[PDB]
Amino acid sequence: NSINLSIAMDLYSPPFVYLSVLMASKPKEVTTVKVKAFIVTLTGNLSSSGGIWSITAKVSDGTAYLDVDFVDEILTSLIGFSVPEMKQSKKDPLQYQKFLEGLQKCQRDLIDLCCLMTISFNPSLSKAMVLALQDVNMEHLENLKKRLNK
Amino acid sequence: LPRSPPLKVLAEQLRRDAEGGPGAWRLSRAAAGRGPLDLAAVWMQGRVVMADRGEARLRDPSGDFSVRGLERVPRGRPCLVPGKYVMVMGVVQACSPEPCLQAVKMTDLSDNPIHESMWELEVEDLHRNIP
Numbered sequence: 001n002s003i004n005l006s007i008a009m010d011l012y013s014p015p016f017v018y019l020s021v022l023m024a025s026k027p028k029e030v031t032t033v034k035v036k037a038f039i040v041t042l043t044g045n046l047s048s049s050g051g052i053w054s055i056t057a058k059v060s061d062g063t064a065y066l067d068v069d070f071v072d073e074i075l076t077s078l079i080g081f082s083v084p085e086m087k088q089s090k091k092d093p094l095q096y097q098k099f100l101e102g103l104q105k106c107q108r109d110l111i112d113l114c115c116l117m118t119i120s121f122n123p124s125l126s127k128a129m130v131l132a133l134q135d136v137n138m139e140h141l142e143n144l145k146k147r148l149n150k
Numbered sequence: 151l152p153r154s155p156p157l158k159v160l161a162e163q164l165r166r167d168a169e170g171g172p173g174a175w176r177l178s179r180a181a182a183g184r185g186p187l188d189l190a191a192v193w194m195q196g197r198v199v200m201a202d203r204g205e206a207r208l209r210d211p212s213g214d215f216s217v218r219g220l221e222r223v224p225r226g227r228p229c230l231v232p233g234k235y236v237m238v239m240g241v242v243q244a245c246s247p248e249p250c251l252q253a254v255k256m257t258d259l260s261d262n263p264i265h266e267s268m269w270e271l272e273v274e275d276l277h278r279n280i281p
Contacts, residue, residue, distance in 0.1 A: 018276065018279055020155075020279075020280070021279060036272070038193075038237070038239070038255075038257065040156075040239070040254075040255075060155050060156050060193075060239075062155060062156055062157055062158040062193045062276055063155055063157075063276065063279075063280070064155045065155055108225070108226050108227065111224040111225070111226035111255075111257070112226040112227050112257050112258060113257075114237060114257055114259060114265070135262060135264075136262065136264045136265060136268060137264060138264065140264070140268070141264055141267055141268050141271075144268060144271045144272070144275060145271060147275075148271060148274060148275055148278075
């Protein structure tokens, strides 16, 4: 029932904030912020357990490193196949070929990822889950100039 | 693997304000009125000026810098081509007279012109928020 008002801009200021600042604020509960980051490296295999895609990676926004979990939807979008669709793709060489092409595309997309990501950080567990990805746009450029030019 | 996160920096910062050496670089920040900023790895961006296998010379608005070890980085959209605007995560090997990086990663950012239009502001914004 309390919000440290003195860090509101530190955590929410448009277009993105910094991981180091978030950590320095010592969050006591799940906190959602937007950062501009890229993937330093994948930290585990792409899993299909539970009938959904999931993988862990280490990202950075230039101020710190953070382990994050990509779960379900974002991965289905990058790959182009859901888990059950992949399982069905198996009985046909050509459909399976498309899946393998989608797997590699997903691999390259994560290698080339450099955008704004909305992350749900759980301080009590020490990592986050990526909620969304967004390409930087003019709106972000204007917000950055605004908090820095006048 | 850097023990320092990949700090966003412009070529001029390493060229002009970096101190120390090999295993220990520090960015002087006297003007800001802050102490030295330790760095080992950096996030840098720029236009590819020239590329010769494993090596390249990039240029940001404040100067040039070279990158080596590119044969070892993750193979994403290929961008080791003159004219491409890219980002590089690398370990600092030298700062003056010309910054040199051992590449950890190089990503193509040519598709979206916003990246290049935002880089200098990003560097300024990040440094303004570091104690």
